[PDB]
Amino acid sequence: VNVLGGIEYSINNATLCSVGFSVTRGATKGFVTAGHCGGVGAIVRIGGTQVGSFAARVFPGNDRAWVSVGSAHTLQGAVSNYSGGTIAIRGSAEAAIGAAVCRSGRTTGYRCGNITAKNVTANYAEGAVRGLTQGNACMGRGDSGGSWFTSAGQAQGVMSGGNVQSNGNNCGIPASQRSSLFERVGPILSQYGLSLVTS
Ligand SMILES: [Cl-]
Numbered sequence: 001v002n003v004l005g006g007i008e009y010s011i012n013n014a015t016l017c018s019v020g021f022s023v024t025r026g027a028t029k030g031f032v033t034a035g036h037c038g039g040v041g042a043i044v045r046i047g048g049t050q051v052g053s054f055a056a057r058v059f060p061g062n063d064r065a066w067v068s069v070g071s072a073h074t075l076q077g078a079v080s081n082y083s084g085g086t087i088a089i090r091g092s093a094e095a096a097i098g099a100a101v102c103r104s105g106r107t108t109g110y111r112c113g114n115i116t117a118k119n120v121t122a123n124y125a126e127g128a129v130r131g132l133t134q135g136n137a138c139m140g141r142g143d144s145g146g147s148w149f150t151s152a153g154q155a156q157g158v159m160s161g162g163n164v165q166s167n168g169n170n171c172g173i174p175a176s177q178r179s180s181l182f183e184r185v186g187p188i189l190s191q192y193g194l195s196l197v198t199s
């Protein structure tokens with residue numbers, strides 16, 4: 001099957017998250033996602049079809065993981081726009097506060113906003129996560145792990161958390177009232193020796 005940013009994957013046939021970005025490591029295929037999405041060795045399906053398992057993760061403290069993917073599957077260096085098309089990923093140049101950014105994930109789809117803060121600590125129940133970047137694109141439960149990227153194709157990070165309301169998302173309040181937090185992609189690629197797939 002095809003591995004594409006923002007699409008749904010299941011963990012141990014029990015929970016759902018969203019693909020961050022296709023990557024390679026040596027001759028191994030994979031994708032980056034959030035560390036809170038599963039433990040090491042947990043089995044990942046895309047389409048109800050098994051593609052691999054969590055190879056490594058850090059959560060809390062950080063919130064990062066990568067999933068290794070079998071050689072028979074096809075990595076696309078792109079992110080789904082949730083309207084039948086894709087946005088090409090071209091690199092991982094980090095954007096500054098005030099820059100436009102979008103995200104993609106299986107609960108709220110493709111949503112856009114701006115970068116609003118850096119170096120934010122989230123106090124999650126399982127522990128604090130430091131160094132997160134904040135934007136004001138909306139998101140909801142299930143978007144976790146999904147792509148954050150600029151329109152020009154620069155990968156920014158993977159969805160970590162934020163100020164979800166009673167409905168499970170923060171799309172029911174204006175952007176000015178949102179905190180949507182992502183883990184920067186650069187340190188994930190560096191820690192695990194991963195190369196971003198581009199197109
Ligand atoms: Cl491939």
Ligand SMILES: [Cl-]
Pocket residue numbers: 095096097118
């Ligand atoms: Cl900045």
Ligand SMILES: [Cl-]
Pocket residue numbers: 123124125126
């Ligand atoms: Cl929490």
Ligand SMILES: [Cl-]
Pocket residue numbers: 092094156184185186187
């Ligand atoms: Cl980064």
